[PDB]
């Protein structure tokens, strides 16, 4: 009487298979879900239940599309459609492996990374350490990561958030990259006191240097020029506090305090990246807006759907969101080259010189954010999220890379420190090499 729908498969943008079903026998005939790559992208793909329906991940959230509908006799069986992801399996495999050995080397609790296509915001790689293997029983893997923290697990971004302040002061004509400023070692603002992570008297930092050296005081002084209302607007336009609509189960919206609810001290914390939370995808999505000449395209992981006959429907593209002008975006890309610039005399070195790749205009921002102590309701003093986000390249944006490390003891390469910059170096460099992309004057971060 019953005519079974054949489960559709999940494939990457080039039709490389991630999940597919084959026929077998045992309740006599029995279909088997194959995952040829094992843990590859299984944070996204998910896994199967005993009945052959989705258990978690996209297998679950797109089950209706993938399972089809059983026929009868007369009602035709509707076989499952094939789901085409924006993932590139080669990029995903490299990134997923590098994320695991950044976790091993740095001693972090966990590590995640997102690679977006610069122009479309398509998700080319999304990875966390400790990924489960859906070709194996779920009950054996309680020590594994079974979900997708890159979309589900918000954190406070720290100084990586300073892209919002940089974007607002340039977009509103309030400063320029070469403006020589006067930055004291500390400021009192909205009832509180904010220090730079190093002691110093008044320094002649350029606006470029404020972001290249990651001066909190400099950032807040420039943010005073913007004001809370224009700053909050830009937060919202960069997409923070809102789900992206990426097409993955369990996405978190993050948290941005509405302006009508700020305390006297909110404006002293938000521009430097404390007092708000975002997912790794939102964070990378911010840098995609600047990479795409100021036009934010919400990220997407589903590329198209293929019906059982073989006809393909592309996923509808989300609408553009103009965050800043193309002129603003290009100026911010160039300023962020200062973060990766080297200077043996020290004066003109950014915070992330190991993130630079010689021959390329790499641009990015380093981050360190205190986590909240569960037992006191107050910040830990030596527990941090380490963040990095960057663009390959500033003059030719192709890839946007976002990284977070949960409280590492060392760099992502295993050297002393607490920086995600070497992980960005590895990934962005490998992306340039494999596409055979071929190879000006130093930026001024500090006047005299
Ligand atoms: Co009927
Ligand atoms: Co240390
Ligand atoms: Co290298």
Curated annotation (Swiss-Prot):
Extracellular side stretches: 1-448
Record-stated family: Belongs to the transpeptidase family.
GO cellular component: plasma membrane
Protein origin, superkingdom: Bacteria
Name of the protein in its database record: Penicillin-binding protein PbpB
Subunit structure: Interacts with Wag31.
Assigned keywords, A-Z: Cell membrane, Cell shape, Cell wall biogenesis/degradation, Membrane, Peptidoglycan synthesis, Transmembrane, Transmembrane helix
Pathway(s) this gene product operates in, as recorded in its UniProt entry: Cell wall biogenesis; peptidoglycan biosynthesis
Shown part of the complete sequence: 129 to 679 of 679
Domain notes: The enzyme has an N-terminal penicillin insensitive transglycosylase domain (formation of linear glycan strands) and a C-terminal penicillin-sensitive transpeptidase domain (cross-linking of the peptide subunits).
Phylogenetic lineage: Bacteria, Bacillati, Actinomycetota, Actinomycetes, Mycobacteriales
């Amino acid at each position: 009487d019953v005519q079974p729908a054949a489960r559709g498969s999940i494939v990457d943008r080039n039709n490389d298979r991630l999940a597919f079903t084959i026929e077998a026998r045992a309740a006599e005939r029995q279909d088997l879900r194959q995952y040829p790559g094992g843990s590859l992208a299984a944070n996204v793909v998910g896994g199967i239940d005993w009945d052959g329906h989705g258990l978690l991940g996209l297998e679950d959230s797109l089950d209706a599309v993938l399972a089809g509908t059983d026929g009868s006799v007369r009602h035709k069986a509707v076989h499952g459609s094939t789901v085409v992801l924006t993932l590139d399996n080669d990029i995903q495999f490299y990134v997923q492996q590098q994320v695991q050995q950044a976790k091993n080397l740095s001693g972090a609790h966990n590590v995640s990374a997102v690679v977006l296509d610069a122009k479309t915001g398509e998700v080319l790689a999304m990875a966390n350490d400790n990924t489960f293997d859906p070709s194996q029983d779920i009950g054996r893997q309680g020590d594994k990561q079974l979900g997708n923290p890159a979309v589900s697990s918000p954190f406070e971004p720290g100084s990586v958030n300073k892209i919002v302040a940089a974007s607002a002061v340039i977009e509103h004509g309030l400063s320029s990259p070469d403006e020589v400023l006067q930055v004291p070692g500390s400021i009192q603002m909205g009832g509180v006191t904010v220090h730079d992570a190093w002691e110093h008297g008044v320094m002649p930092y350029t606006t470029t240097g404020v972001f290249g050296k990651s001066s909190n005081v400099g950032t807040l002084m420039l943010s005073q020029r913007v004001g809370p209302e224009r700053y909050y607007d830009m937060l919202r336009k960069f997409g923070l506090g809102q789900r992206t609509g990426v097409g993955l189960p369990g996405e978190s919206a993050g948290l941005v305090p509405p302006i009508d609810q700020w305390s006297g001290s909110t404006f002293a914390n938000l521009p430097i990246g404390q007092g708000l939370s975002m997912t790794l995808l939102q964070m990378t999505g911010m840098y995609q807006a600047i990479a795409n000449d100021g036009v934010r395209v919400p990220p997407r992981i589903i590329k198209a759907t293929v019906a059982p006959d073989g006809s393909r429907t592309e996923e509808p593209r989300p609408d553009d969101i103009r965050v800043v002008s193309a002129q603003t975006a290009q100026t911010v890309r160039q300023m962020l080259r200062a973060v990766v610039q080297r200077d043996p005399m020290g004066y003109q070195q950014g915070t992330g010189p190991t993130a630079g790749v010689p021959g390329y205009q790499m641009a990015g921002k380093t981050g360190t954010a205190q986590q909240i102590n569960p037992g006191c309701g107050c910040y830990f003093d030596d527990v941090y999220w380490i963040t990095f986000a960057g663009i390959a390249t500033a003059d030719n944006p192709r890839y946007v890379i976002g990284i977070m490390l949960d409280n590492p003891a060392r760099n992502s390469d295993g050297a002393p420190g607490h920086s995600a910059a070497p992980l960005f170096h590895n990934i962005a460099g490998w992306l340039m090499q494999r596409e055979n992309v071929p190879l000006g004057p130093p930026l001024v971060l500090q006047a005299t």
